[PDB]
Design a protein around this ligand. Structure first.
Ligand code: HEM
Ligand SMILES: *[C@@H]1O[C@H](CO)[C@@H](O[C@@H]2O[C@H](CO)[C@@H](O)[C@H](O)[C@H]2NC(C)=O)[C@H](O)[C@H]1NC(C)=O
Ligand SMILES: *[C@@H]1O[C@H](CO)[C@@H](O)[C@H](O)[C@@H]1O
Ligand SMILES: [Ca+2]
Ligand SMILES: [Ca+2]
Length: 336
């Protein structure tokens, strides 16, 4: 519908400032539209910002949190002291400056930087982007972010309170396909959670299901489990969710199709992006988001392992026929 100063067409005039913050983020924050640590840090940030939302606290007369309100930036002084928010300060400050410089709300800016960051990573779906979240927020209550040492019952209860079913919890975890850890075992800094930390694919669901065989570092870190090969890090909650009877069949269904996985993830992220808001009050500016390059590789069981190495945990469905690869066991380099 309208033409923005740069000659681009958009549906609403409210979308025109976003082409300018698109260029800034791609050039600066993402260092030339790359899919590296700034994208992975922003994905941790959008979850940690959005999940500080609790209907139960509200119901009990307490402030339950404003959801996707950018409070992790406006109140970084209190929220970055939370256990789950370590290693985010440098990214929060960079985002703060962009927000202030373009006059956009912090909650909107985090949703936008997630959609734009994912467009730099092959295989990603185009995420919906809505604008209009108010810039005013209050600090998130503590203890609303799931931890890697939490039991599955604990994660599903916290996630369920926020509004997600067990299925959507598994769908949301597709973001660990673009992930590493820095603070759980600092000895193997940026060890990847799957073999393709720069490709949004199904490898994370396949690989967390393989039998834990290797200790990748000198010792085990917090909430660390044995992984299937050198260089890969396996987190306890991911290992447990892969195997728990409440989430095992959805986890298994996510292994053979990158198309189904992307579809499910996009839908769960659209829900997470408006926690604390009425989406009918927001303006759709999804047309600003660029397409990612396609991922043409097929799902594989890496380095000589076969179906006999995966710990099938969904009792009702047989494991999908996934291709195997020859070669020895891969050793993963740190995520860039
Ligand atoms: C079931 C809840 C989840 C738990 C317990 C969990 C836990 C963690 C932990 C402990 C790390 C490592 C952080 C570090 O030491 O550097 C991590 C990394 C990451 N998580 Fe999650 N996560 C969960 C859900 C999600 C969701 C829903 C998203 C986003 C949609 C997400 C995106 C990421 C990303 C992209 C990274 C990689 C960060 C990097 O490489 O620097 N996580 N997660
Ligand atoms: C959104 O709200 C925050 C306040 O929570 C505003 O951020 C401040 O902006 C001024 C300049 O305008 C800076 O000097 C402060 O350092 C900022 N504070 C924080 C905590 O970041 C922000 O400007 C507001 N944005 C809009 C568009 O209203
Ligand atoms: C596999 O090799 C990589 C480097 O290629 C290491 O990061 C890993 O620890 C393992 O030796
Ligand atoms: Ca928040
Ligand atoms: Ca991947």
């Amino acid at each position: 519908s309208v033409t923005c100063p740069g000659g681009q067409s958009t549906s609403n005039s409210q979308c025109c400032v976003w082409f300018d913050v698109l260029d800034d983020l791609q050039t600066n924050f993402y260092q030339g539209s790359k899919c590296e640590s700034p994208v992975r840090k922003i994905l941790r940030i959008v979850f940690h910002d959005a999940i500080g939302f609790s209907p139960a606290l509200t119901a009990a007369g307490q402030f339950g949190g404003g959801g996707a309100d950018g409070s992790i930036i406006a109140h970084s002084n209190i929220e970055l002291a939370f256990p789950a928010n370590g290693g985010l300060t440098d990214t929060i400050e960079a985002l703060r400056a962009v927000g202030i410089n373009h006059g956009v709300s912090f909650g909107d800016l985090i949703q936008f930087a997630t959609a734009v960051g994912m467009s730099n990573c092959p295989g990603s779906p185009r995420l919906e982007f809505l604008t209009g979240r108010s810039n005013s927020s209050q600090p998130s209550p503590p203890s609303l972010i799931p931890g890697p040492g939490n039991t599955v019952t604990a994660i599903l209860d916290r996630m369920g309170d926020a509004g997600f079913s067990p299925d959507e919890v598994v769908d949301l975890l597709a973001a660990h396909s673009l992930a590493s850890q820095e603070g759980l075992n600092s000895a193997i800094f940026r060890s990847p959670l799957d073999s393709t930390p720069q490709v949004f694919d199904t490898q994370f669901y396949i690989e967390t299901l393989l039998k834990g065989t290797t200790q990748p570092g000198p010792s085990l870190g917090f909430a660390e489990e044995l992984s299937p090969f050198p260089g890969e890090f396996r987190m306890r909650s991911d290992a447990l969710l892969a195997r728990d009877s409440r989430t095992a069949c959805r986890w298994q269904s996510m292994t053979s199709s990158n198309e189904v996985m992307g579809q499910r993830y996009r839908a769960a992220m659209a829900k997470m992006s408006v926690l604390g808001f009425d989406r009918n009050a927001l303006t759709d500016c999804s047309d600003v988001i660029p397409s990612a390059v396609s991922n043409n590789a097929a799902p594989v069981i890496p380095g000589g392992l076969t179906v006999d190495d995966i710990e099938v945990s969904c009792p009702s469905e047989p494991f999908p026929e996934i291709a195997t690869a020859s070669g020895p066991l891969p050793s993963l380099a740190p995520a860039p």
